[PDB]
Amino acid sequence: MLLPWLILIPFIGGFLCWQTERFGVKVPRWIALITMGLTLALSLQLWLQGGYSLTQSAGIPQWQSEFDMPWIPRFGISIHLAIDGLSLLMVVLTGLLGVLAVLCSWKEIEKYQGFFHLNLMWILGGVIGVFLAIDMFLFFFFWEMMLVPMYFLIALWGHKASDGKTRITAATKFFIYTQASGLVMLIAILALVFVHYNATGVWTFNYEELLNTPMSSGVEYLLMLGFFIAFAVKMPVVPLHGWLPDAHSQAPTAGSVDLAGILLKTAAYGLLRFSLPLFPNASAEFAPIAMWLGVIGIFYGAWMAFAQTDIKRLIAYTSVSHMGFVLIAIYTGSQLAYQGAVIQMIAHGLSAAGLFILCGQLYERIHTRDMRMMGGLWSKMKWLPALSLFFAVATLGMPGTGNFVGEFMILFGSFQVVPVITVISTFGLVFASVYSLAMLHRAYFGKAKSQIASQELPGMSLRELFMILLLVVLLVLLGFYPQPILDTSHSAIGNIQQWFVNSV
Amino acid sequence: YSRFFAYTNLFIASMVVLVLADNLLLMYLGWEGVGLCSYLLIGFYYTDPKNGAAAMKAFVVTRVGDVFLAFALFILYNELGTLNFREMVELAPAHFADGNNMLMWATLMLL
Amino acid sequence: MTITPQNLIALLPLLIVGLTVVVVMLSIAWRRNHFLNATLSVIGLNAALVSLWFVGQAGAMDVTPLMRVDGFAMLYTGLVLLASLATCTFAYPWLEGYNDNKDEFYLLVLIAALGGILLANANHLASLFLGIELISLPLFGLVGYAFRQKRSLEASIKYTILSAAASSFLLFGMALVYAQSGDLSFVALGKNLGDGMLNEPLLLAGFGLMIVGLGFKLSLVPFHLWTPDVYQGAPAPVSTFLATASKIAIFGVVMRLFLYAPVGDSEAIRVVLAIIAFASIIFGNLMALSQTNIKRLLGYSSISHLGYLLVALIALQTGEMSMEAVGVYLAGYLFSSLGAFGVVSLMSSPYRGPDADSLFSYRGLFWHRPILAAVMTVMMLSLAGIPMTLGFIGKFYVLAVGVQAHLWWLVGAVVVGSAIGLYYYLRVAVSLYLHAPPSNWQYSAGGIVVLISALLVLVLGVWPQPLISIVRLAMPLM
Amino acid sequence: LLKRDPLNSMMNIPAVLSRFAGKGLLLSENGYLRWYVASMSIGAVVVLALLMVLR
C-alpha cells in the first residue's frame, strides 16, 4: 500500500523542485530535503510496522507488503510491488543515501539547481523502484529508467575542471554498458516469458508465476547468462568494470550523484532475488565461474586501486574489490554467507559514501585530486584527515566497523562451501589493507609536495561534519551490533537459500 | 599530545579486549584493534616518510598474520561449529577422534 | 466487380483527398493565395481523417478487384494522413520565405497522401505499383522544390534517377510474377503450386526484383545509399514526409503483400530478407557514428529503423503479434520522426534563400529555444529505444517478435545497433545542452505539433496500453 | 603493469572496431549517382543469386 507512495514521492518531489525554482534558487534543495525525509520516514515506518524480526521463513514468495495494479494487460504486465526484509533494508539505505546526497549539494546555488534536484530524485525513485518491483517488465523499466538521469547529471553537472568531451565520453560509455546489459537482461526476460507461455498458455510477467517454469538444460543457462551480464555490468564484475571509475572520475564535484545511483547495490540484489530463485540449477553450475570471477575482481580492483594516482578512482576500484567479495558470497548457497553479503553491502555503501563525501570536501578545500599534489594534510585540516582515516580503516576490513562483519561472515559461509576461494579472498583482504594504507600515506601523511598543500585550509561546515559523524556512528553500530539488521533480513535470505538448495 | 594519548588509550582498550575475550572472534576484534593502534603509533611522526613506510611494513606483516589467524578461525568454526575456547576443549576430541588433519591445519594457522 | 454505395462509402478518404486536390487546383487557378490553399489542403486532409470513422462504420470488405478495406487500411491511412497534415503544418513557415510559387507544395503533398492511402488500401499488384509511383512523383516535386539551391536539385536528380531504376526493377519483377502465376491478386501469388514446389525459380526471381525495388523504397541495404543525400538536400518538411509517410505506406503494403501471398512462407525469401535486415541494421547504425549533419544522421536512423521493421516482418508467418508489433513500431516511429524533423524544419524556417546554407547548428539550442530543445532530446531518446518512450515499446515488440521465431542473429543485430544508436542519439541529445556562440501562429502551430508529438511519445511510453489496444483493434482480413 | 587497466582496453576494443567499420562503410557514400545505380544492380545480382542458390 505504501510502496506506490514510496516510489512516487521522489518523483513528485523532483517535479516540485523543478517547479518551485521560480520562488527562489535556494528553494529546490529544501523541497528535495523534505521529500527525501518523507521517503526515509516512510521506509522507517515500514520497518517498524513490518515485524521483520519475528517473521519466519516460509518459502518464496513471502512479502511483508504487496501492491498490484494492471499496467499492460495484453502482455499480463502489472505495476507489481512487494517488500520483505532485504528489499526494505535496501529501501532504507537508498533513502538514507538520498538524504545524504541532498545535504551534500546544499551549497550549490546554480541557476538550474531545480533540474539537478529533479534529476537526483528521479535517480532515487528509479533505484527504489528497482528494489520494490517484482514484475520483470517493471523491474527492467526502473533498471533502465534510473540511467538517463545518471547520464545527464554526469554529462552536464559533472566535474567542471575536466573537459566537456571527457565527461560526455564517460557518461556515454556508462550508458552504453548499462543499457546494453539491460537489453540482454530484457531478452532473457522475454525468452523466459515465452517459455512459460508455451508451457502454460498464460501471458504473465510476474516473478511468482515465472518461478515454476519448466525449462531444459541449456536454455536456463542462457537466461541466467543474460541476467548475469546485466547484474555483472552494474555490480561491476571484471572485465565489465571500466564504466565505474570512468563515471566516478567525471561525477559531479559534490559527490552526491555518486551516492544517488552508482553506490547502491541493485545488481547484487537482483542476483539474490532474480538470478538464483528463477534459475537454480544453472546458477549452481555457474557458481565456480562466478566465484573465480569474484576472486579475479578482488585482486584486479586491489592492484588497480594501489596504482591509482586519483582518489576517486581508488575508491571506485575499492568498490570493485568489495563487490567481488559480494559476488563470491552470493554463489555459495549458504545462509551465513548471504547474511554476510547483506551486511557487507550495507556497510560498503556507508563506507564508500563517507569516502566520497570526504573526497569531495577535500577537493572543495584544495581544488586537486592527484596524490602527487597532496601530503602531510593532517596538520592543516581540523576534521577531514581523521575522519578519512576512520573510513579508510573501515574499507580495509577492520573489526569495529560493519565491513569486517560483512566479509568475515561471507568468508565463514564460503569456507563452509568452498575453502580455496575463501583463503585467496582473505589474501585479497590483505591487499585491501595494503591499498588503504597506500592511499592514507600518499594523501594525508608525509611532507607537502605542492604549494596549494602548504597553506592552512578552512574547516568543514557543521552539516558536512554532522552527516559524516552520522555515517561514522552508523558504521560503528553496525560493526558492534549488527543483530537488528540480521533479524530484519533473516526471512528473505532464508527463503532464497532454501529455494536455491532445495531445487538442485 | 592528545592524538598520542588517544591512540595509546585505544591500544590499552583493544589489548584488554584481546586478553578478556572468551571467543575467537572477539579476540580477533582485540587483535586487529591492537594491530591498528600499533600502526597508528609507529608512524606517529608522520612528517618523515620513513616512519610511514615502517608503519606500512608493520601493518602488512601483522595483517598477513591476522589472515592466518582468520584461516584458523574458519577451520575451527567449520569443524566444531563454535568459537568458544571452552567449547573447543570440550568437543574437540569427540569430533577429531577419526581424523586429525583439520585440527593440525587449525593449530598450524594459529601458530 | 462493380462499385456499390457501400463500396463508395468505403472509398471515402480517397475520394475526399482527390476532391481536395481538384478544389485546391481550382483555387490556384482562380487566384494564387498561400493561406487559402494551405487551409483547403489541411481541411481536406482532416476531412479524410474524420471520414475514416465513417469508413470504420461501413465495415471491412473488398472494394475493387484491386482494393481491400479493413482495420489495416484504417491504421495506415490514419498514419499517412497525420504525416501529411504535419508536413503541411511544417511547410507553411518554410514556404513563407519562398520567393517563387508556394501553392504547388500542398497539391503535391495531397497527391502523395492519396498515393499513401492507395498503398494502405492496396490488395493488388497494379494498386501497389500505382501507389508506389503516386508517392514517388510528388516526392520528386517536393525534394527539388527549391531547385535553385544546388543541394535540393542534386537530391531531386538522384532520387528521380534511382526511383525510376527501382520502378523499372519492380515492374519487371511484377511481370515475371504475373508470367508465373497468371493473376495479379495478392492472394493468388503462388496458389497454382502445391506439394512442396513453392520455390518456383521465375516466381522467386520476380519477387526478388520487387524486393530490390521496395528495398530501395524502404532504404534497405544495399539500396540505401540515396537516403542521406536525398534527406539532406530536400527541404526539411519534405524530409519529414519522406521519412514518415512514404516509408509507412510502402511498409504497410509490403506487410499486406507478404501476409496474403502464399509464396511469402517460402524459406529462401525469408533468409534473403533476414540478411537484408541484418545488414540494414548494422550498416545504418554504424554509418551514423560520425555525422555532424542532423539530416544524414536521421537518414541512417531511418535505415536502421526500417531494418528493425523488417526484422519484425520476417516473423509474420510464425508469430501472431508480428503485424501488431509492426503497427505499434510504425506509430512510434511516425511520432519520433515527426518530432525530430519538425524541430529541424522549425529551425530551418523560413527559407532564407537558395544561395545561403541551411545549416542546423544544434549545439546550444536550449539557451534560445528551450521547448524545441526539450522536444528534440525527447525524440532523440525515443529513437534510441530508451524506456518511457514509444520507440522503446516498438523496440520491445520487435525483440519479443524476434524471440518468438528463434531469429537470434537478428536479435543480436538489434542489440548491437541499439548500442550504436545509443551512442549517436545521446551525442546529439547532449550536444543540445552545450554552449555555442516565427512571430506568427503558423510557427506556433508547428511548435504545438512537435510538442504534442513529444507528449504523446512520453505518455504512450509510460502508458502504452491504449495504443496496443488500438493496433490490435486494427485487425485485417485472414 | 596494470596501471593502464588492460581489461578496460580489451572491452573498449569493440568500440574501435565499430568506429573503423563505420569509417570504412562511409566510403560508399561518395555522392556519385552512377555508383548508386551500380550498387543497386549489384544488390539485384546478389539478391537473385541468393534466391537461386537457396531455392
Ligand SMILES: CCCCCCCCCCCCCCCCCC(=O)OC[C@H](COP(=O)(O)OCCN)OC(=O)CCCCCCCCCCCCCCCCC
Ligand atoms: C560479457 C561479454 C558478452 C556480453 C556483452 C553484453 C553487452 C554489454 C557489455 C559490453 C559493452 C561494451 C561497450 C564498449 C564501448 C563503450 C562505449 C564507449 O567507449 O563510447 C565512447 C567512444 C567515444 O569516445 P572516444 O574514445 O573519445 O572516441 C574517439 C572518437 N571521437 O565511443 C565510440 O568509440 C563509439 C561507440 C559506439 C557504440 C558502442 C559500441 C557498441 C558495440 C556493440 C555492443 C554490444 C555488445 C557486443 C559484444 C561486446 C564485447 C563482448
Ligand SMILES: CCCCCCCCCCCCCCCCCC(=O)OC[C@H](COP(=O)(O)OCCN)OC(=O)CCCCCCCCCCCCCCCCC
Ligand atoms: C561489430 C563487432 C563487435 C560487436 C559484436 C560482437 C559479438 C556479439 C555476439 C556475441 C554472442 C554470440 C552468441 C552467444 C550465444 C550462443 C548460444 C549457443 O551457442 O547456444 C548453443 C546451446 C543452446 O542450448 P541447447 O543445447 O540447444 O539446449 C536445448 C537442449 N539442451 O547453448 C548451450 O548449450 C549453452 C552455452 C553456454 C555458453 C555460450 C554462451 C557464452 C556467453 C559469453 C559471454 C558471457 C560469459 C560469462 C560471463 C563473463 C563475465 C561477465
Ligand SMILES: CCCCCCCCCCCCCCCCCC(=O)OC[C@H](COP(=O)(O)OCCN)OC(=O)CCCCCCCCCCCCCCCCC
Ligand atoms: C615466508 C613464509 C610466510 C609468508 C607469508 C605471506 C607473505 C608475507 C610477506 C611479509 C612481508 C611484506 C612486506 C610488505 C612491505 C610494505 C611496506 C613497503 O614496502 O612500503 C613501500 C611502498 C609504499 O607505498 P607508497 O604509497 O607508494 O609510498 C609513498 C612513498 N614512500 O609500499 C609498497 O610497495 C606496497 C607493498 C605491498 C606488499 C603486499 C604484500 C602481499 C602479501 C601476499 C602474500 C601471499 C602469499 C601467497 C603467495 C602465493 C603462494 C603460492
Ligand SMILES: CCCCCCCCCCCCCCCCCC(=O)OC[C@H](COP(=O)(O)OCCN)OC(=O)CCCCCCCCCCCCCCCCC
Ligand atoms: C550481444 C547481445 C545479444 C546476443 C544475441 C541475442 C541472444 C542469442 C541467444 C541464442 C540462443 C541459442 C539457442 C539455440 C537452441 C535453439 C533451439 C532450441 O533448443 O529451442 C528449444 C526451445 C524451443 O522448443 P520448446 O518445445 O519450447 O522446448 C522447451 C525447451 N526449454 O527454445 C525456447 O523455448 C527458447 C529458447 C531461448 C533461449 C534463450 C535466448 C536468450 C538468452 C539470453 C541472451 C543470450 C545469452 C546471454 C548473453 C551472451 C553473450 C552476448
Ligand SMILES: CCCCCCCCCCCCCCCCCCCC
Ligand atoms: C540500513 C541502515 C543501517 C544503519 C546501521 C544500523 C546498525 C544497527 C544499529 C542498531 C542499534 C544498536 C544500539 C541500540 C540497541 C538497542 C537494542 C534493543 C533491544 C535489546
Ligand SMILES: CCCCCCCCCCCCCCCCCCCC
Ligand atoms: C527519459 C525520457 C525523457 C524524459 C525527459 C528528458 C529531459 C527533457 C528536457 C527537459 C528540459 C531539460 C533542461 C536541462 C537544463 C540544463 C541546464 C544546465 C546548466 C549548467
